[PDB]
Every structure is written in C-alpha cells, then in structure tokens.
C-alpha cells in the first residue's frame, strides 16, 4: 500500500511530461512536418501513412483508458476487476507503440511513396531526439505503472 | 441503478475524447484542407459541399442535445420522458454520420467540381485514419448510451 | 412559472451554440473571407459592405442586451419593466438579422464592386451551410425566448 | 441610491462590450491593416501616425483610470473626492477620441506619406463600420457615466 | 500608513498596464520588427543588438524582484530590510531602462549594421508612440513606488 | 528553519522566471530559428543537432524531477533521503547545460552541415543575449538551491 | 506618270514605318498586354476578342495584297486589271481597320468580360499613343496610295 | 503557260504569309500556351497530345515536300511525273489539318487529362482567331495550287 | 560642293549612332522602365504619359522624313525644293524634343499619378545619363545638317 | 550519275529539316526541359545524363563530317577515298543515335535519380512526337544517303 | 607605309574583339547587374552612377570617331588633317576610360548609396576579369593605333 | 603543298564546330549556371572565379590570334615568320585550357566559397559532357594545326 502512493506519484509524472510533450516538444504536429515536394496532398498523405495515430493522442487515449476504471470503482463505492483493466490497457497502448513507429525511437527521415507523391519523397521529422526522450519517460512510467498494478493484483489473489 | 453509473462515466469519456478530437486531431479543420488548384474559392466551396457540418460541430451539437433533457429534470426538481429524448437525439446524430461522410470512415481524397473550380480537382483530407478512429469511439459510445437508456426504458 | 425554467434552459442553449459558432464554425472571420483579386483593400472593403456587423457580434450584443435587464431587477431587489426590454431587444436583434444578410440564410457568393476593387469581384464566403444551421438555432431560440417572455408579461397584466 | 445601481450595471456592460471589441471586432488590430505598397516599414509608420494609441488600449487605460478612485475608497475603508476623478478621467478619454480619429467615426481609408513611403499611399482600415458602432457604445456609456456621477455630485 | 495603501494601488496599476502593454501594445515582439533586407539573420541579429532585454521582460523581472522581498517578510512572520530591496531593485530596473534604449523614448528607426547584414540596414520599430506612453506610466509608477518606499523606510529609522 | 523559507521563495522565483522564459523570451523556439538555405529539412536537422533538448524542456523536466521527492514525503505523511535526490537532480540538469550549448551562453550563430544541407550553412539563433540572461538566473538559483539543501544536509 | 514615282516613294514610306511599327512600337505584342487578374486564359481570351487580327499583321497582309498584282503584270510582260486590285485591296484593308478597333485610334483601356475571366477585368494596352501615330501614317499612306492609283486608272479609261 | 505564272506568284504568296504566321501570329508557339494547373509537365504533355506537329512545322514540311519535285527537274536538266508529286503532297498535308486540329479552325480551349494532370484541366489557346485566318489562307492557296497543277495535268 | 560631302558623312554618322542608341543604350526601352507599385497597368500608362513617342522612334521617323526629299530627286532624275523640306523636317523633330522630355535631358525620375495608379508614384528611368549623351549627338548633328542646307540655300 | 543528283537533293532535304528541327521543334532545348523538383542542379544533371550530346548537335556534327570529305576532293582538284568517309561517318552518327536515346524514338518521360536530386524525379520532355518525326526524316535521309554513296563506291570498284 | 598596313590589321583586331566583347563578354549589360536590395530604381540608379557611358558604347563611339576622318579624306579625293583627328579622338577616348572606371580595371564590387537605395547597397558586377582582358586588348590596340598614326604624321611634317 | 589544303579545311572545320559550340552547346553560358543559394552576387562571383575567360571567348580570341599572321602576309603582298606565330599562339591557348578548367574536362560541379557566399556552396555546371566533347574537338584540331605548321616548318 506504500506502492499505491508511487502509483499516484507516477500517474502525475507522465501527465506533466505529456503536457510538456504535447505542447512544446511536439506542438503543431503536422505543421512542423516537412517534405521535399511541391505536390499538394503528398505531405498530408505521407503523414497519415507514417502516423495513423500520433503519440500525444495515443498517450491521451491511454491515460483516458488508464483512468476510466479508477472512476468506475469510485462509483460503486470489482476493485480487483479495475486493476485488471488498468494493466491490459496500459500495456495494450505499449504494443501500439512498438507496432507503428517501431521501437520507441523517432525517425529523423521517412521516405514516403504514397499516391499524390510523383515518386518517393524525403519527408523530414522535426525535433526527433527531444521527442524520443519523452517516449522513454512516457513508456518507462507506462511500464512501471504496470508492475505496481500487477503487484497489488497478486496481493489480492494470493492473500 | 448500476446503469446510471456507466452513463456518467462514458459521458465523461466521450467528452475528453471529443476534446482531443477537436483540438488536436481535427485541429484547424479547414486550414489543413488541401486542394490541387490555384482558383480562389474552389477550396472553400469544396469544403462546404463535402463537410456541411464538421464532425466536431455535430458532436458539439450532439452533446448539447443530449444534455438538455437531463437538465429539464434538474430544474423541475417528466424524467422518463427525457430519456425518450436522450435516445432519439443520440441516434439521430448517428444517422447524419452514415448519411454525410458516407459511413463513419474518413475519405482520404475527395473530388469536387463545384462552380468556382475549372473542372474536377483533387482535394486531400488530412489525417483521415486518426479522425476515423475517433469517429468510431464517438459513435461506439453513442451506440452504447442508446442501450443503457433503452434497458432503463425497458426496465420500466 | 414552469416556463421560467425553459427560459433558463434555452438561455444557455443559445450560448453554448454561440460558443461553438463563434469559435469553430466562424473562427477567424475575415481571414476565411476570400476574393478573386490582387487588389489591396478590395477584400477589406468588400467585407465591410456585406458585413457591417457580423453575426457573432450581433448575437454577442443581443445576449448582452437580453441580460442587462435581468441584472437590473436583481439590483432593485420594474420586474414587468424588465420583461419588456428582454422582448424588444431580443426581437430588435432579429430585425437586424433580416435586414442585413437578408433572410437568415448565408450567401455562398457575394459580388462586390466597392471602390478599391477595379471592377466587380467575386468574393467567396467560407463554410456557409454550417453557419446557416447556427443561424437557425440562434434565431429559433431567439424567437422562442420571445414567446415565453410575452406569456409571463401577459400573465402579469391579465392577472 | 438607484444611481449606483446602473453605474455598476453599465460598468459591467461596457466591459463585455470592450471584450468583444478587442478580441473579435478589432482582433489583431495592426495585422488586419492593409496598405498599397511594397516598402518595408511604410505600413508600420502609417499605423503609428494615424493610431498613436489604439482604441482598445485607450479604453483599456480608460477603464483603469476610472477604477482607481473607486479602489482608493475601498482601501481607506475622500469618497466624494474620488467621484471628482471618476468624471474628469472618463471625460478626458472622451476628448482624445474626437481629437485623434477625428470624431468617433472609423475612417474607411487613410492616406499616409510618412518618410519610408515613396509618396502618398492608400491604407485601408478593416471593418470600420463595426468598429464605429462599438466606439458609439463605448462613448455613449462614457457619456452616461458622467451624468450619474454629476447627478450624484449635484445631489450633494 | 495611509501610504502603504497607495503602494498597493500603484502596484496593481503597473500590472494591468504591463498586461495591456505585454499583449496588445507589444504583442508578438519580434514578428512586428521589420528590416529592409533579404538577408536571413540580419533581422534576428539587429533585434538582439538593440534589444538585449526587451521592455516587457525587464518589467516582468522588475516586478518579480519588487515582490520577492514582500514574500520573504510574510515567511518570517528584516521588515526594514525588505523595504531596502524593493527600492534598489525598483530603481536598478530604471537604470537599465535609461542605459539601453536611451531615455524612456522608443525609437521609430534604428540603423543596424551587424554582421549578416551586407551593409547598414534600416530596421523599423512597430508602434513606438503607443509603447512610449506605456513606458512613461510603467516608469512613472516605478518612480513613485520608490518615494513611498523611501518614506516608510525613513519613518522607521527616524522614529 | 529559515533555510526552508528561501527554498520555497526561490522555487516560486525560478518558476515565474521560467514562465517568462518559455512564453516570451524563447517563444516559438524553433519557428524563430533562421538558416541561410532553401533546402527542405536542413533547418529541422540543424535544430536537432544543436538543441536535442531545448532549454525550456530541460528546465521543465528539471522542475519536475526536483518536485517528486518533495511529494513522496507529503504522501507518506525518507525526508532526508528525498533531499538527497533534490540535490543530485538539480545538479545533473546543471551538467547538461555546460555539456550541450557549450557553457550557459547562447550561441549567436551555429554552423551545421548535417546531411540534408548541401554544405555548411549559417544558422542564426534569435535573441541569444536575452536567453543567456535567463539561463544565468535559472542556473544561479539552481546553484543556490544546491547549497541550502546541502547546508540542510550538513546540518543533520 | 510623275505620280507613278510618288507611288514608289510612298510604297516604301509605309514599309519602313511598318518595320519601326512592327518591331519597336508594338514589339512583343501580347507580352506587353496586361490585365488585372490572376485568371489563366482570361488574358489570352481577352486579347483574342479585342484583336482578332492585330495591326502589324493586317498591314503585313495588306502590303502582301498590294504587291501581288504588281508581280502579276511583271509576269505577263491586264495592266489596268492590276491597278483595280491594288485599290480595292488597299481600301478593303482600311474597312477592316475601322470595323475592328473602331476609328484609327488605339484604346488605352478595354474592359473584357470573356469566359475564363470571373467578372469584367480591366485590360491595359501598352503604348497606345505611339501606336496611334503609326496608324495615322500607315492609314494616311494607304489612303494616298489609293488616290494615285485611281488617277492612273482613270487616265487609262478616259484616254 | 499562264498557269505557271500564278503558281510561282501564289508560291511566293503563301511563303510571306507563312513567315508572318510563324514569327508573329504563332510566335513562340508553346510558350504562349496556358493551362490552369500547378503540375510540372501537364502543360508539355497536353501540348503534345493536341499539337503533335504544330501548324508552322507542317507547313514547313509542306513547302519542303512541294519543292523537291520541282528541283528534281532542274537538276536532271520526269517533269510530268513531278507534278504528280506536287499534287498528292500538297493534298496529303491538307488531310492532316482536318484530321488533327479538327477542321481548319483553332480551338479557343482544349481540355486535357493526360497522366501528369490530376484531372481534366482547362488549357487556353492564345490567338485562335488570327491563327484560324492564316490556316484558311494557307489551305486556300494549297487548294488552289492543286487545281492549276491538275488543269496542267488534264491539259496534257 | 564640299558641303554635300559632310552631309553624307554626318548622315552616315548619326545613323551608326542611332543604331547603338536603339539596340544597346535604350535597348528594350519600356522593359527597363521601373516603377514603385504593384498595380497592373500603372507602369504602362505612366510610360505613355511621359514617352508618347520614344526617342528612337522619333529619330526613326526623323531619318525617314529627312530622306524622302532626297529620294524624290533621284526618281525625277525640285532639288532646291527638297532641301526646303530637308530643313523644316529636321528642325520640326528638334522642336518635339524640347517640348516633350523637357529639354534634351533624360529625367532620372518621373512622378506619374495617372488613373490606374492609386496615387503619385516613383518611376525610375534607366540609364538617363547615357541616353542624354546620345540625344546631344543626335540633336547636334541635326542642328548641323540644318546649317549646311541653309548655307547651300543661301548659296543659291 | 543520275544518283549523284538525288544525293544533292537529299543533302539539302535533311538541312532544311534540321533548321526547322533546330529552331522551332527543339528551340531552347534545356529551357523546355521540366522536372518535378525544387532542387537546383537536379534538372541540369538529369539533362546531362539523358542527353550527353543532343540531337541537333549530333546532326550538326554529322553534317559537318558528311561535308568535310566533299571539300577535300575539291581541294585536290582520293575521290573514292572521300566516298568511304561520307559513309562510315554518316553511319557512325546513326549508331550514336541508337545507342543513346535508344531507338529513334523520343521519350515522353525519363525518371532521373542523379546526385543533386533527393530521390528519383520525374523529368518531362517537351514536344516529343514532333521531335520523333524529325528523327525519322533525319535518320531516313541519313540512311538513304548511305545507299547512294555505297552504290557510287561499288560502281568504281566493280568497273 | 609598311605601317599603314598594320593600322588596317589592328583596326580590325579591335573590332572582332569589340564584337566578342559586346555580345558574349558583356551581353545584356544591365540585366547581369545585381544589387542586394528589394528597392525598385536603386539598381537602375546605381548603374547610372557607376556607368555613365558603358564600355561597349565608348568603344562604339570611339571607333565611329576613329573612322569618320578616314571617310572625309576619301570624299575629298587635309590628309594630314585627318591623321590629327584619328589621334586626338582615339586618345580622348582613353582619357574617358581612365577617368570613369578608374584604371582599365573592372570592379568586382561597387558600394552604391544613391537616392532610392535606403542605405548603401552592395552592387555586384558580372564577369569582371573577362571584361578586364578585353579592356586591355581594346586599350592596347587603341594605344598602338596612336603610335603608328603619330609616326605617319611626323613622316609628313619632317619630310 | 597538300599540307595547306587540310589547314584551310580544318580551319573551316573548327569554325563551324565553334559556332555550334557557342550558340547551342554553351548557349547563354552564365544564365544556365545554377547555384544552391539565395545570396545576390554569389553566383556572379563564383562564375568569375572558375571561368575567368569562358571557353568560347578563349577560342574566339584563339581564332583571332591565329589569323592575324596569315593576314600580315596577304597585305604585304615574313611568311615563314608568320607560321612561327600561328604555332605558338595556337599552342599558348592550349596551355590556358589545361591550366584553368583543370584539363579539357568540364566539371559537373564546382564548390565556391567566395566572399558574398555565406559558406561553401554547390554550383552545378549545365551540360558538362557535351561541352567536354567540343573542347576535345577544338583542342584536337588545335593540336593538329600545330603539326601541319611544324612539318611545314621542318620542311623548310
Ligand atoms: Ca498540437
Ligand atoms: Ca478547430
Ligand atoms: Ca474570431
Ligand atoms: Ca488585439
Ligand atoms: Ca509576446
Ligand atoms: Ca514555446
Ligand atoms: Ca512581334
Ligand atoms: Ca516560333
Ligand atoms: Ca528597342
Ligand atoms: Ca537552341
Ligand atoms: Ca547588349
Ligand atoms: Ca553565348
């Protein structure tokens, strides 16, 4: 139960990071996206292909899903049932970060060859290293919040 | 009894989703809209033809219409007659998403030949896949809020 | 007095609509305004001619005038005198919507021939249909808030 | 007694009006300013010559100066000596609107030939009619707040 | 002690002015800065030279320094020691306004000849007269807040 | 005892400073970044090479890391073990400012020849002197918060 | 027969004028044509409407037709038959200058409202007064060459 | 005998006409070609599709082919066998003007949707009426030179 | 007798001068004309107002008019009656250079406010000094050819 | 020897074609060359790769080489030696047209991926079909001038 | 009189050089002139100041003046009088090349500060070294043609 | 005797080659020159540094210098003393092609960092391969004309 503390400490850590991430690091997401091309739509299409669901929004949704269960239990006041969700969700949103983007590392260059683009065009990601760090932290916490939630889970099923 | 728990949770849910949808996903809805043309107005007319009421502003109206009936009650304090509204509205707004936009799926491209345009021209929707995801979540919860209010209806 | 409720219910309905209207639907009002011309000022002038007082601001003022009386009475605590204002104002701001703009329907094209413009230029309104809906609702409520206010008025002069 | 009712109402009134005026009507005051030239700085100098203190920033200062005297009293808690200020200020700011801008009416066009400009050039004010309306409302209430404070002055 | 009032009255006056100053008068500070040149960096460099520390930020810092002492004393609750700071600071930030900018008067034109610039370029300041007024008021108050603080200082050292 | 007074004051201090720094001084950090080139991406790559973590986002992380230990305590309510963190963090972030940026002084110019760029090119940092001032204030207070927490450490 | 001289003197006068006209005065004919519009084709169309057959080419053709007969007779060596042609042609090409262009006077402004053009656009003719003079001379000579040719005609039919 | 008079006259005629046509009327044939697009190559491909052999270069080839047979004779010095060519050539080139260009009349507009173009686009021919006139004169004389050489053929 | 020597020499002189003047000095007369404006047509109208007949095209006409009388004679082969023309023409064209252009000196700048222009605007003549030199040489020789033909006139 | 005539007839045919080819058909050769790219040099490089020696210049050189021998013999006046050159040259310059350009047919599109170009870029040839015809004729004549030259060659070695 | 030959040999040498000079080396004279400025007229004015009379035209005039006398004598056929002109002229046009341009050496950079220019602007001369050579040759010949003309002059006044 | 045959042939040869080279191959020499920069003058200075005397203008001078000696003779009508010049000139101009341009091979790219340029920049020579071919032909014939005049020299 001295871990139910750290959960609250880390639950905020990822938030204030997500804020800094969502606003300064990422900022106007697609505006910063650059492609060597005079082709209209080629940039819009190349962005959609490599970012079906951008990071800030995955993390947005993730934190929304790792929060709804915490609300459910407060409404019943099924507590063990909530812990289950907060794990599979928080872990599911890590699988969607490996698949898609591939490996918690931001690209500096993606070579898109979608339709409007006449040939393969060099699209350049803005500010990747800074973004990378904020993946690490966001993913680290996401990974840690799991362990503490599995612990409290077992602590109920063992005892 | 447990029914009106989820209804407030999912209500709060679809809101935070709607926020992220409006501010980030859609962003400056029309400004991100791109067309292959140099004709002044062709973009504005082809955006009107294909998006007469943007998703965010429908959902905006949706969450408004599905909120008045639950406020009528709070003021009077009829209730069963409000839920009658909370269903048909939330369903009506679901109808205007299949009709218009042609089925909860963002078109990656649309071809408009409205008057200002010299001929038919390519217009490229930005971020269709991500918008598509959020339409699903917004329509799913909408499809869900229907049930809980009908189970509550059939419960009486 | 079960109508003094609906007045409060509709008084908010037009607001949250005005917000959605003022921000998303309309947004940067004149920036979205387009005219086929390389003439500086021709756009600024053509906008002033067809929109002496834009909608969001009429509705802004309208709601300010259909609110000042409600404040006056709270300060006296002349109640029937306040109801009178909330009607003529709310109705006056409907006459200024018929005259000017002509018929609660947004134009898709206005052909301006003001001074800076060399000849008549085709100015294109952005996003008219969406705006039109929000006139209907804003005008509907404006029209309904009248009826309920005239009712309460008569209910005092009859009884 | 009934006098200090309207004074707070109209004070709140002119504020909400001032808001809509600053944020929407005027908007990005200078950015909307357009001139028929390709000279860097001609626009900035012709905006300074004709708008040394933008309407919104005068009214901003106005509502500031007409607020300190009514705060002096609250702190001390003189009062009749504050109203003396609340009149002359609100009137002084009325003087700088006839002088400067040349009579509560927005010029649709101004012709500036300041140094950077090669000659005299057309500069087109955006949205003059709407700004004109709001000047009227801001000056009207200002003209009114004068009376209620003079009636209150003559009342004593 | 009827002066400790006016201090609070003037401490706010400069603020609400600083707000109007920081937002409307100045606004996007460097964006409004114009230079007759096609030289990249020449504008950025010419701005840095003539504005090492812009006004709004000096006033920002000034008010931060003429506030920290007022917080210190509230934490002890050395009261005379705080008055000392609020003077030297508030006065120091007036010396940095004379030196730099030279004389509480905004330039309408500065002729910069820094490196990237090929030759001397005419850089034009936006909206100087309006800014000038707001210096006067900001500096006036700054100058007045001193007198009242020196008075209260002496009132403690004399009595 | 008097030590934990200044620590909260200077903590509040460096915040308001950090605000003005982020919103005004730095502003739109990268957008103000200018390079002498016409190559798409050369600017974005030369900004990544020389600013892998912008000052504001380091300090953002800094004030975050130097805040968790002081929250661990509030929740448990160890304390002496938190101050151990409050020092090393605030010092570690001081190390990444000498390393990276090359010594608390904003470069007025940087010369990047990353791949997209055809050769080495001039890139001009905007507002280096003012940023330099704020780095000093942010590092000074950081250097100070170290002492008060070590005096508090040596005090025990 | 002392007039058959002047015919040769004036036949060259119009030529060297046509050269100066065709090259310097007119020059790149359509390139100099300007229209206040961003509409592609609107300029090309507005030019075709007001200049179905430009001057230099009418004069080119005219001089070709007032020359072919002079060649015919040289080939027979029907002499009176040639004089007839050189008149009707040289006069026909004056009717096509009145009709079309209207009155041997070049416009300074033509207001075209052809299809591609969104509305009526102000198209500006380059260098009209200079062109006008060269019409006068070209038309004067054209008019004089007639008189001398009708004289020689009658001199054969009378005698 | 009188037949071979006009044939040299009209031959010289159609030349001077061809000159004025090439240098002034058509001018820089393709450069004057305008299309409503921003796609690189769409103009070049739509000019190739609709003008595989420009009028001037057909007539150029025409006057070449209708000149060799009259040179064969001068060198040999057969003659009646050359006139056989001087007819069929001058007629064949008349066929490729009805086919291609679709009947001796310059199209004021053509609508091309070749690959590079995103869709069908407006392409505006410059000076169609004047070109039309010269096609008439070039085809008329061509139609005439046929007769004089057939009368000369039937004369034998 | 020696008079008609120089007259042919200086005639050949002013020609070669006129050539260099037209092709190099003046060049593309109007294209080199620059105005401080973004108004379509303001340049074309301000060139018409100030140069109704360009120098080169006057001199072109000049050398034409002063050549016909000397051709009348060659054909007739009256002569003394031609020289009468060769003087008045060459003098008349001298009059239209003082009037118009305002005295054999190229204006470095002209200020035109014809209709299309929003106001008065700077228009900068290119290469005024060099053009000025050639006007002098063209007018000098013109002033000289007058004398030799008047001495020849007074000689008879 | 009635073939030595046709040689002179065809020797001119290719010329007047080359003129029409060099001036109107081809014209400003590289200016008409278009590539979908904002890359400086990418067009210059892509042109050099696909056109090491453009057609008009090959034909220019060809005709220079199929002419020098005809001059040599006129200077001696080794006649059979000249015929030999006029063949191998005229035929060599046909091998350089097959190799390079590949098959007497002009491309409408070439996909260049040379250095300055970021990726493969679509370069568009202007006016290919017209050019193609003029290859056929230029190559036809080139091919015919061979046969007549080999005939006259054999006519000397047989007899 | 074996020098009257070389005069004719050098009189042509400067010509064919002037041609190469006038066309390729110099070419479109002012078009190649570049100035770092967005100021209209500043380039036109800066060109007029540093090139009151460009080289090709001085040489054009020079050769016209060193030719008129050679024509005069042919018309008389005062021979010694012609030699005098061909010297002072050919030498006068060397003084106007020292004064103006200063020293038979073309600038690579001229810093113009004429009126339209806001401040001093860097104007860049195109292709100076090549031009310089052609001054040397044009001036060399000009200098040599003098010596031979003074010789023939003295040869008449001595003998 | 047969030697002075080829010398006139190859002289005429290298001319027609020089023509095609100047007008078509090189064309507008500098205008086709492209550099990756936005600095006014960087292109003009980097063209001067790497092409102080363009190929065409060297060969222009070459054919001039190798023509005077053969004209000295025609006028005098020494001869053997002219051939002495016709060799050294034609050889000297061969030296300034190895030195300068660095060996009869057109550089496809050159990297210039002259003053106006901010740093070293890519400058792309247009049509290097074709120019290379013509340098070969011009230098080959030049290398040949040397022999025939030395054989003619050694013949005496
Ligand atoms: Ca964002
Ligand atoms: Ca939005
Ligand atoms: Ca707005
Ligand atoms: Ca504002
Ligand atoms: Ca700011
Ligand atoms: Ca920022
Ligand atoms: Ca022309
Ligand atoms: Ca052509
Ligand atoms: Ca000219
Ligand atoms: Ca060419
Ligand atoms: Ca030239
Ligand atoms: Ca050239």
Residue numbers in the entry:
A (entry chain A), C (entry chain A), E (entry chain A), G (entry chain A), J (entry chain A), K (entry chain A): 19 to 95, 135 to 216
B (entry chain B), D (entry chain B), F (entry chain B), H (entry chain B), I (entry chain B), L (entry chain B): 19 to 95, 135 to 213
Q: What text appears in the publication on this structure?
A:
Connexins (Cx) are a 21-member family of integral membrane proteins with four transmembrane (TM) domains (M1–M4), two extracellular loops (E1 and E2), a cytoplasmic (CL) M2–M3 loop and cytoplasmic N- and C-terminal domains (NT and CT). Cx monomers assemble as hexameric hemichannels (or connexons) with a central axial pore. Hemichannels from adjacent cells dock to form intercellular, dodecameric gap junction channels (GJCs), which can cluster to form gap junction plaques in the plasma membrane.
